[PDB]
Design a protein around this ligand. Structure first.
Ligand SMILES: NC(=O)C1=CN([C@@H]2O[C@H](COP(=O)(O)OP(=O)(O)OC[C@H]3O[C@@H](n4cnc5c(N)ncnc54)[C@H](O)[C@@H]3O)[C@@H](O)[C@H]2O)C=CC1
Ligand SMILES: CCOC(=O)CSc1nc2c(sc3ccccc32)c(=O)n1CCCN1CCCC1
Ligand SMILES: [Cl-]
Ligand SMILES: [Cl-]
Ligand SMILES: [Cl-]
Lengths: 493, 493, 493, 493
């Protein structure tokens, strides 16, 4: 685990449009904080509607028929993405450090996981660019018919603060591989890594206007994207509330394409025949990863009665082993929550668990004199009507419940408006296949949890979102299909 | 062209839920009219929110894990669809007659085209059922990963009055082939053919609740579908206004998947080297088909100056050759518009063309003492800011314009919030390919127009809709992708 | 289980070329026998080189650019195949009876399985016809590139006597769906069902020359196919010896495409945790089905030592329960072998098992005064160097062996030049996945055996064959891919 | 056009097995010559059967279940290929020089085209590695069925001398991306660039035994590959004669999979409406490229009578403009033929053209005192029965013919046992589509020629070969499909 042997210096703080750095139209700036210390790191240019309009015009122009980005070989779009991955690999120490400092994110994970994921995802996407293909189709009648899987056009992409870099790359990788242009709005909490990447987009040689990055707030810059009359598509990861607003704003304006990923209340089902240590470990990391701030957090763990008490005991032992503190310091194993709102939400929900009669096994309160820290918290004997069993907490708060009827537990697992993911732990082939088939969730892990890769599509059932990202299947959502049908004198098979 | 040698008798007038005929919960009924005579044909049970709730419950139950429709072989879903096609072929005379009588639709077209399209589309969809496949994916790490392309669940499907049968089958064919269950709301104007088909769904042996048909109005039954908390997806063909309302209602409620097809203002570009007679014929039929009531109507025809006057002359000669009257009577070549609202809209727009200075070549007024008839109408020297050049008329009203700059005409062709289709007429390979690539439209025809087939995906760019129907690509929109990732001791390629 | 309530009368005994019945050029005929009685059923026209030349010319002409079969809609090729399935369904009683009488095949299986498989396979193939698609490809440079998945042309198809109808349809279904024309040579033992199907091909309305059926012998009619200078592809199921000759003859002549399926020595691995009754049943039916005359026969069954004796006991009990006799008589559960050569081969191999020291548990000799009957025979304590462990027997002869090292048994399972299929019986997810991945076989069944369907590709690893039949993947082998690359002035994504 | 600013020094002259350099078992070496000077460049270790056996054992071991190459992530196979491309880019000057010196290949083409093609092809193949996917399949009955697209195993790959590097990469890129191991036999004429690449395979970090390179002769090392009992597949580009021998040897031994590309007699059809200068240029380069030593050489050019004389005149003017000499010297535009056999064959065929009455427009004899040089030669009024119209010349010899019947010229174009490629020159859409559809050739170029890219599949119809290389479609030929079918208690769609 190498580190930056020199203190981080913040350089890139401006709006990125047509490969140059812009002041906000208003002249306004907003502060950016270190969640572990509550101290301002810097000021960043505050994008708003006016700045979004500049970025959209730039993106529109870069998408015009005859432009460099429309006319270059697909393989060259791919080359540019591979180059960007190489640049991020070059600046890995710097990026992992900035990510950890701005995002409250453990540095070892930032370096070994987030940065690795960004690099691998970009390289995966680079490979698709010249492998996006349409069809030739044996239509009835004397016609030649083919399809073009064109890029859609200008894609507005709004990303959250929990995985700033990974989410940036998850959005831009596919969009660019397919030939789109993008207007990106990073989370107000975490604009800095996106702006560094923008410098590397310029360095790699992407044509101007192909990627534009507009830091700013949700109701301002975000809303301007969702309601813009010349944005063809909007992609978003974040809260359900905002997802609704985005879909509504898209409907009112220009009926732009919308894809959403909106978190979850993801269940695990642990059968009595399960490898118990393996289930405890994966379910543990499954809920606690990055201070509980994962859309896929395994926030309801149902365990067969006969192994329930043992499951709970071992889970508690594991949760009691964390070291809280600054995510930069080696050996520290839990960083802060991102901000006050999240902090407040986690505490309120923890209090509801105590009130509504859940058994507190450990944690249950805040930690320290600075930083938005929350003790890792475990509740057992949780019941389905409790707030901590229904609401996404997005904090280090684990719920453990028992069942003895498998039919009943699948119904309980499914009894939510969410549906992002689930986990099944068993040694039995038939149970693994039939349970995974019955769960209304986008990804089901069997005898593991939290395994996400560029090669697999990822997305929600129900209110956890719509559409899929990554894999072969995800690329479909960044193309617009055109059918071309040509009259011919006579066809032959 | 065979005919029913016995008078049509209306039998099926009720709400279809769980394969039985239901009265409306309210007890209310609404009238159904023959647009050619303005006479009531019958009364039909009026579905509203309460009836939609009954259909959704039925559809939900038919979709449950372990149900007949979830557990039957995919090939058997396909068999059921093939059987339904055979039944519609059996009742072709009856259906074509009912379609023509209720829809104001020329009987020869109803029989030879609409009914043929329904049959062929169903058979096409039947073939996909056991050919819907997921993937196995060489994910990083020691895992086995596969995907399931599951049906989504309960699909709400709202269809228009212009092609009642074709649109019914365009919706239910793919949805059912993929294993979904459906709640269908036919247009208030044209419920009758859908209800006959429902009798044939029962006869074919589809499990109850797999298809439910709820006749009724837009703001009542339609709105209940779009806002329902247990409908997983809504599909819609109709007006832009309603498309917006549907997307908004889906966002406010349960973030259900939405696909829309919303008509157009589709352009043709006729180059000087074009086969002129061929371009005139296809552009003519392209705008005039079914009294102009096609989403893809070729409602802006741009012709190179040197052949413009000849194009206009020949177009006028062709338009002056129609025989208006009852769509049932042989040799009649133009039926009525569907209803008063459409009628009023076409007349108002025709008047705006005269006012704003378009040259009237023929038609321009109503026809007859009964029926919503409009003279076939041609305007030349139309300019881009005129109402008849911007608004979808949905009537027998042709606009012809000239150009001499090809760069300019492509920009004019593209200068619309619509984008459903377009036509290009030229003998030159390079022009055909480059022009079709540059047009922002879902289907581009070359040296033809209006060629739609079950084998090709169909849908809009921009505000003409989102998603694609039919072809291989259309089937994707009726599946929900689940990734299953299984921990293994060691993988091997 | 319905039966023909009228005695079978043989009608179709001639060579089928251009949809008419032909005498052999030589005037020669050959006899056809009932294997259960050794009595001649009829005489059939003997095709030889001269007749093959007539069929190839007919097939070539039907494949010419501009012909009905090249110009008809793909959906119409599909319609024709669906019609043929409907006709075979109509004549199911007759076909199942003829199959059983000519092939020595149990009538209940013939009716319920073989005929069902033919019908289902044809319907599956019908569905692909208009779903065979090429690609459009974003090649480097200013070009438009697309591919056509054309039919190959004249396909020579040689099929065996064990599943005459199923194999006929397995060959012609895909070939025709893809638009090829075919020259079929049924086994000399079993020409009759193929000739009836030919009458139904004529009745369904296939254009003449699209299917031609040339009964005759291997070294005569078969060899003429394999060496023909105007046959584009040859497909074959049968013996390894002949497979070699076919590949060699194809290399010497016109380098025609070759696909082979050549039987096996397929292993099962039964782990100690397996559902034992389920493993015994499937392994039993897996080797004994159709008198052992299946390419996929489970002819080496390795059982973990701790359950080996119990496995063997239960296997023996099951084998001792058969009733031998005429395949037409209800309750009869084992018919004859096909002919004297097979009969002789099975007996010789059974004798080698006794000689080389295998433990005879039951059977071991012939049965009856007429018909090529062999007692169902079980050997335990078989070792890998014995003839019955290495050679495909193609008779009712089961080999059971023990193991205790899993690494070792996989190596033993794989230690063969064959590789058609295998079976794995265990309750453990990891073992099921890792073992199936390690076995060098085309199809691996888990906790079942002998499950073959039109939707899955089927074919061998190693010397069990090359290429795959059926599924999506099998269709690729009946197309020839053409790339078309068109110079354009400027491309756009 | 940069050059090596230092003289080339030959380093790598040994057999490459398990990532180390081996002497031949016999101790024998063979000489390697510069075709431009007829001087020996070096000696290279001569591989024979014994050495092939060592390489196959190494390849077999590297392919074993549990090996590094079988267990590494697919994305890592891709990474290794990307690294190799980067290494070849690093050594581009050296490789382009060695290629030109050993292969008689113009240095500017070697550098700008061959080396670029190698790099781009490797990068294309790298991108597929983790995008090779099987299927999940909705089989009839209560089963879970999926497929694995496994690597085949040990692939023997025999390549020719005309494009040593490009062909090496065309073979190993796909084979390795798919996870195979390879035993490569470069042409005896041109082993040197392959051995340098082998050093870069070692440097990139490929596991030992994954690639093995065995220089040597055809009937010795080549024959040992084709007849080997433990090689799973053989791929070959070269002469028809050898293709036959390979297919036969594969049939006699172990029925290994075979794919062949075998050159052609590729036709162009130039219509009267064609852009004439464009057709002349592409047809010219189409036959003359790399001294006529391209499988796709446009060796029959049919021109409509009305433009035939002009076509011939302009073609002659272009052919008379070459500068012969050393392929290393700037401004030199034609190098030597590869060796004496080719040289002799070209001269003999040129003499047959004079004898049989073809009109000699220019060239017709040898050139210089050393090097296998042949004057660029044009024949007009060539007729279909002449040797130069039927036999692949593989020299700088152009045939031009006239036609006036389009039906007739397509039949003439098709009247060959070859079918690798063809060209069509016209401005008319319908002709371009219908002619290209009618030509029995693997690639058809329209208004261009010789446009080959990694993204498109490439291969012959008829005796020009079997199978396809590159594109998505080519990758299929380097996988072996396994179906896995698992019994489950109950399936759900
Ligand atoms: N799916 C996921 O991974 C995430 C889920 N969440 C959930 O949402 C809850 C609230 O967290 P927030 O930070 O408020 O998430 P949020 O959904 O409001 O913020 C995420 C992104 O949306 C933008 N945004 C906010 N308001 C917007 C608007 N009106 N229009 C357009 N864009 C807008 C933000 O600026 C940011 O870029 C969390 O407690 C958690 O449960 C939060 C972040 C990520
Ligand atoms: C290859 C893409 O990059 C990464 O995987 C970075 S890490 C990571 N990304 C995402 C999630 S949700 C999600 C949704 C979309 C895209 C990426 C992710 C997550 O939860 N994580 C931590 C897993 C730690 N795990 C602990 C045990 C196994 C992995
Ligand atoms: Cl498509
Ligand atoms: Cl998928
Ligand atoms: Cl292809």
């Amino acid at each position: 685990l190498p580190v930056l042997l020199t203190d981080l210096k913040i350089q890139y703080t401006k709006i990125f449009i047509n490969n140059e750095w812009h002041d906000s139209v208003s002249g306004k700036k907003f502060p950016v904080f270190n969640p572990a210390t509550e101290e301002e790191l810097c000021q960043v240019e505050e994008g708003d509607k006016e700045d979004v309009d500049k970025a959209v015009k730039a993106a529109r122009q870069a998408f015009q028929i005859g432009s460099p980005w429309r006319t270059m070989d697909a393989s060259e779009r791919g080359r540019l993405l591979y180059k960007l991955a190489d640049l991020i690999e070059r600046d890995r120490l710097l990026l992992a450090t900035m990510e950890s400092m701005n995002g409250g994110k453990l540095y070892s994970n930032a370096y070994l996981s987030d940065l690795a994921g960004c690099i691998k995802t970009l390289r995966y996407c680079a490979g698709w660019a010249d492998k996006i293909q349409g069809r030739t189709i044996p239509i009835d009648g004397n016609f030649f018919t083919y399809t073009r899987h064109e890029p859609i056009g200008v894609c507005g992409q709004i990303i959250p603060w929990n995985f700033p870099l990974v989410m940036l790359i998850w959005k831009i990788g596919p969009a660019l591989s397919c030939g789109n242009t993008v207007v990106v709005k990073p989370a107000e909490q975490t604009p800095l890594t996106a702006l560094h990447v923008a410098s590397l987009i310029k360095e790699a040689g992407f044509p101007p206007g192909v990627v534009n990055i507009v830091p700013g707030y949700g109701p301002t810059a975000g809303a301007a994207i969702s309601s813009h009359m010349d944005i063809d598509k909007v992609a978003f990861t974040g809260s359900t509330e905002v997802g609704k607003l985005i879909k509504e704003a898209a409907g009112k304006s220009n009926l732009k394409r919308v894809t959403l990923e909106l978190g979850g209340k993801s269940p695990c089902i642990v059968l009595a025949d399960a490898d118990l240590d393996n289930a405890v470990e994966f379910a543990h990391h499954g809920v606690f990863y990055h201070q509980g701030q994962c859309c896929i957090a395994a926030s309801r763990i149902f365990v067969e009665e006969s192994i329930y008490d043992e499951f709970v005991r071992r889970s508690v032992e594991r949760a009691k082993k964390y070291i809280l503190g600054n995510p930069l310091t080696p050996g520290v194993t839990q960083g802060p929550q991102i901000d006050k709102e999240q902090y407040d939400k986690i505490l309120d929900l923890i209090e509801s668990g105590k009130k509504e009669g859940a058994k507190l096994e450990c944690g249950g309160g805040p930690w320290g004199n600075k930083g938005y820290f929350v003790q890792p918290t475990v509740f057992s004997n949780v019941t389905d009507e409790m707030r901590i069993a229904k609401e996404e907490i997005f904090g280090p708060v684990q719920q453990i419940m028992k069942f003895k009827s498998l039919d009943d537990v699948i119904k309980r697992a499914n009894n939510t408006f969410y549906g992002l993911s689930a986990g099944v732990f068993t040694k039995d082939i038939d149970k693994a296949i039939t349970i995974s088939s019955a769960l209304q969730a986008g990804t089901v892990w069997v005898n593991c949890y939290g395994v996400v890769s560029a090669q697999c599509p990822f997305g929600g059932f129900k209110m956890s979102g719509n559409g899929r990202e990554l894999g072969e299947y995800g690329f479909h959502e960044y193309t617009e299909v055109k059918t071309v049908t040509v009259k011919i004198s006579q066809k032959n098979s």
